[PDB]
Amino acid sequence: ASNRKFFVGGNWKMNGSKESNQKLLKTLSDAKPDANTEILVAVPFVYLKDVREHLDKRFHVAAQNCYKVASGAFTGEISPAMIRDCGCEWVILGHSERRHIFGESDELIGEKVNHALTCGLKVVPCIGEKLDEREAGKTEQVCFRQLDAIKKGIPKAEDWSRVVIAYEPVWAIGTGKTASPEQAQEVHHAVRQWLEKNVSQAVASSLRITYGGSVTAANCKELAKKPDVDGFLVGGASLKPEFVDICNANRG
Amino acid sequence: SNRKFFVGGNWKMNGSKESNQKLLKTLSDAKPDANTEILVAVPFVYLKDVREHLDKRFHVAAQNCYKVASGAFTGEISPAMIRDCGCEWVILGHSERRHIFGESDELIGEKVNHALTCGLKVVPCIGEKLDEREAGKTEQVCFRQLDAIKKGIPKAEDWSRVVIAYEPVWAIGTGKTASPEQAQEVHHAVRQWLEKNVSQAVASSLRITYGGSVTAANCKELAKKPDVDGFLVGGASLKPEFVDICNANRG
Ligand SMILES: [Cl-]
Ligand SMILES: [Cl-]
Ligand SMILES: [Cl-]
Ligand SMILES: [Cl-]
Ligand SMILES: [Cl-]
Ligand code: NA
Ligand code: NA
Ligand code: NA
Ligand code: NA
Ligand code: NA
Ligand code: NA
Ligand code: NA
Ligand code: NA
Ligand code: NA
Ligand code: NA
């Protein structure tokens, strides 16, 4: 086999306050979840510095987005340099909400991946297909196009060491469709085969491919057991006490 | 004029703990014109720290926000989060958000609605591009953008918490420099629009600020224009000359 460290990210999205953040982080920290699992929280920009100062170094802190240059005339945007200046080392890039609500292109995501890695951050690039794409038989076509753009952005092959991929079944998020652990495993296996052919066997065997569909305390252990599922990028559940149980998904 | 002069400095995507400390110490120590309202619009990651550092004499603004309090909008910041950082202002509809990030008139109106509902004060930005100005569409474009902002105002009293910024996008990064006369012409047209579409009371009280190229050399001549009630400054906001621009309405 290959032994990839399990990775659980909690994407708070546009949620949090000084008061609610303190309560969530105390619960997570006091619970001491599975020591063998890497744990990340992706928090709103306005709380990045305070969350990183409060939270023990065991836990990673990510920004939920960044732009593709260090500074300039981009009112409202945040750079990797500003994320590092807040003491944080991670960023989520190409999240389905950024792609499909805010219209971020594959090429823009590739340029953000390039700039973040150049500045020394670690990145969680997100991929995934919509319902119309899946129904038209374009799951691999869409995912491979998105992966091509991320690969083009990797400055040097060694930098894959700082990448965690998240697959989002957008076709299942906010449609009546539900993705099964079997459907998750099928896509993750296809992504790993893509990495083997287009990057290297060494990168394919070491890279964490995490699942960004609906993850609950009730389904997390069955997903974790799948051989090509190396963890999660959790949405709504990341704000809830069940995030601790999801962090323990790979424990036994 | 009985409209209080208003000078905003938009840092855009610029700042660090170190550079911010130097800029804010210089601004604070300079004690610029106490009769002028001064705002700094800073990157989200520094909002809380800038508001804690700066005396209440200064306003601190976010550079953007979204149109609901919470939800599944990875990367977005709400008015509730801006208030939670101790800040009371937000810039909305900046030319960069409209023309680089594709924010629609309708979205800007919804953001204005949500920010005002949550108790923030707002700086909605309007302005026409070069192709629009050359086609004689300056007023058509500005009035379309103002219609969408007005649709977002929850109740007429809420204009008390609005400062409009006119950005001559046609002049920003086309190499062209807009004259104080060209600024005054647009500001007068916007004030007449407010008189007809809102009220004479709002038209006479609302600050219409200029967001074109403002320098130490042109700021006093712009300030003296009867319908120019201050500035939304870009690059100069990071420089010592921002203090001179804050003093534009003196003498
Ligand atoms: Cl970190
Ligand atoms: Cl490669
Ligand atoms: Cl404030
Ligand atoms: Cl009104
Ligand atoms: Cl009237
Ligand atoms: Na790695
Ligand atoms: Na669903
Ligand atoms: Na493989
Ligand atoms: Na299941
Ligand atoms: Na697994
Ligand atoms: Na303060
Ligand atoms: Na009223
Ligand atoms: Na009023
Ligand atoms: Na210019
Ligand atoms: Na004036």
Author numbering:
A (entry chain BBB): 2 to 253
B (entry chain AAA): 3 to 253
According to the publication:
Triosephosphate isomerase (TPI; EC 5.3.1.1) is a glycolytic enzyme which catalyses a critical step in glycolysis in which a toxic triose dihydroxyacetone phosphate (DHAP; produced by aldolase in the previous step) is reversibly converted to d-glyceraldehyde-3-phosphate (GAP; Rieder & Rose, 1959). The TPI, in most species, is a homodimer with the substrate-binding site located close to the dimer interface. Only the dimeric form of TPI is active, and disruption of the interactions forming the dimer can result in inhibition and inactivation of the enzyme. Triosephosphate isomerase (TPI) is a glycolytic enzyme that has been researched as a drug target for various parasites, including F. hepatica.
In this study, we report the expression, purification and crystallization of FhTPI and its monoclinic structure at 1.51 Å resolution. The asymmetric unit contains two FhTPI dimers. In subunit C, several loops were built with an alternative conformation of the main chain. The main secondary structures of the FhTPI monomer are a single β-sheet (an eight-stranded barrel) and 15 α-helices, which are arranged in a α/β barrel motif. There are 27 hydrogen bonds and seven salt bridges at the dimer interface that stabilize it. Out of these interactions, of especial interest is the interaction of Lys50 and Asp51 that participate in hydrogen-bond and salt-bridge formation at the dimer interface. These two residues do not exist in the mammalian hosts of F. hepatica, where they are substituted by Asp50 and Phe51 as shown by the aligned TPI sequences. As attempts to crystallize FhTPI in complex with the potential inhibitor TCBZ did not yield any diffraction-quality crystals, the structure was used in molecular-docking experiments to locate structural differences between parasitic and mammalian host enzymes, with the aim of developing new parasite-specific inhibitors of glycolysis. In our studies, both the ‘targeted’ and ‘blind’ docking approaches identified TCBZ binding poses in a region within the dimer interface, distant from the catalytic residues.
